[PDB]
């Protein structure tokens, strides 16, 4: 379980903003994260990497879910947020997330 | 396996190409690219270097060069190629670099 422990330590790290070279502003919510983790699950983040990134405010409601998924592998889906998460996952080029939303069975 | 396995393998792949790596480890001449975030999870020695100032490149003494890659492979994979011929130069480096999990194995065998 070495990799499980490392990722939850990374997750704990970003909650505290530690070692986080990436700060994301969506709506009015600011999020700390690691570019390296973001690049693992998102083609959009891979592409805009080259300080401070602003994302569409219409994602604020579900951005935390999307990010938790990156650090934990669990996308907090619901019949009520499914279409929102899907739209955000497509735009942010998060392959695994689109698959999860499309296959989602309430 | 699982989600964490896949993410760490990607970060491993990343550093093996110097992508999204914010750390440069210069050990006696051979450099290793890595992620501070991951370095911090396994050793407080790296936590201190990161905070207690060190500009950019981290310069360690050439003594580890030999085994360093192994110790670093362990960070990104959870497995240290503990050979009967390195078991000692690996353990000494683990205690030196302050990597608790690494020493434990060196001892186990």
**Alpha-carbon span B18 to B29, nearest angstrom:** 17
Residue of B nearest to A69 (CA): B3
Which residue among A5, A7, A21 sits closest to B7, beta carbon to beta carbon? Answer: A7
Residue pointed to by tokens 């792949």: B13
Contact residues, chain B, for A39 at CB < 8 Å: 10, 14, 19-20
Can you say whether the dihedral through the CA atoms of B52, B41, B104, B10 is positive or negative?
A: negative
Pairing status of strand B30-34 against strand B23-27: antiparallel
CB count, 10 Å around CB of A84?
Answer: 18
**Alpha-carbon span A90 to B10, nearest angstrom:** 21
| Helix or strand (DSSP H, E) at B23 | strand B23-27
**Alpha-carbon span A19 to A17, nearest angstrom:** 7
Contact residues, chain B, for A73 at CB < 8 Å: 2-4, 7
Distance in Å, alpha carbon of A7 to nearest chain B alpha carbon: 6
Q: In this structure, are residues A19 and B40 in contact, taking their beta carbons and an 8 Å threshold?
A: yes
The phi and psi torsions of B59 (rounded to 5 degrees) equal -105, 105
CB count, 10 Å around CB of B81?
Answer: 13
Domains in chain B (CATH in brackets) are 1-109 (3.30.710.10)
How many Cα atoms sit within 13 Å of A11 on the Cβ side?
18
Instruction: From B21, B15, B29, B27, select the one nearest B73 (Cα to Cα).
Output: B15
Q: Does B54 touch chain A (CB under 8 A)?
A: no
**Alpha-carbon span B6 to A30, nearest angstrom:** 27
Instruction: From A31, A6, A36, A104, select the one nearest B3 (Cα to Cα).
Output: A6
Calculated CA dihedral for residues B59, A46, A13, A30, nearest 10 degrees = 130
**Alpha-carbon span B72 to A51, nearest angstrom:** 28
Q: Does B10 touch chain A (CB under 8 A)?
A: yes
In angstroms, the Cα distances linking B7 to A73, A94, B32, B54 are 9, 13, 20, 28
- Experimental determination approach used: X-ray
Q: Write the secondary structure of chain A as one string of H (helix), E (strand) and C (coil).
A: CHHHHHHHHHHHHHHCCCCCCEEEEECCEEEEECHHHHHHHCHHHHHCCCCCEEECHHHHHHHHHHHHHHHHCCCCCCCCCHHHHHHHHHHCCCHHHHHHHHHCCC
Q: What are the beta bridge partners of residue B25? A: B32, B58
**Alpha-carbon span B96 to B106, nearest angstrom:** 13
Structure tokens at A54: 């602003």
The CA angle A72-B21-A19, to the nearest 5 degrees, is: 60
């Amino acid at each position: 379980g070495h990799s499980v422990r490392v990722l939850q330590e990374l997750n704990k790290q970003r909650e505290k903003g530690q070692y986080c070279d990436a700060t994301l502003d969506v709506g009015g919510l600011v999020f700390k994260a690691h570019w390296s983790v973001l690049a693992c699950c998102s083609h959009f983040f891979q592409r805009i990497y080259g300080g401070s990134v602003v994302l569409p405010a219409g994602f604020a409601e579900i951005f935390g879910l999307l990010l938790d998924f990156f650090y934990t592998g669990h996308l907090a889906l619901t019949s009520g947020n499914r279409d929102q998460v899907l739209l955000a996952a497509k735009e942010l080029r998060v392959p695994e997330a689109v698959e999860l939303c499309q296959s989602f069975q309430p």
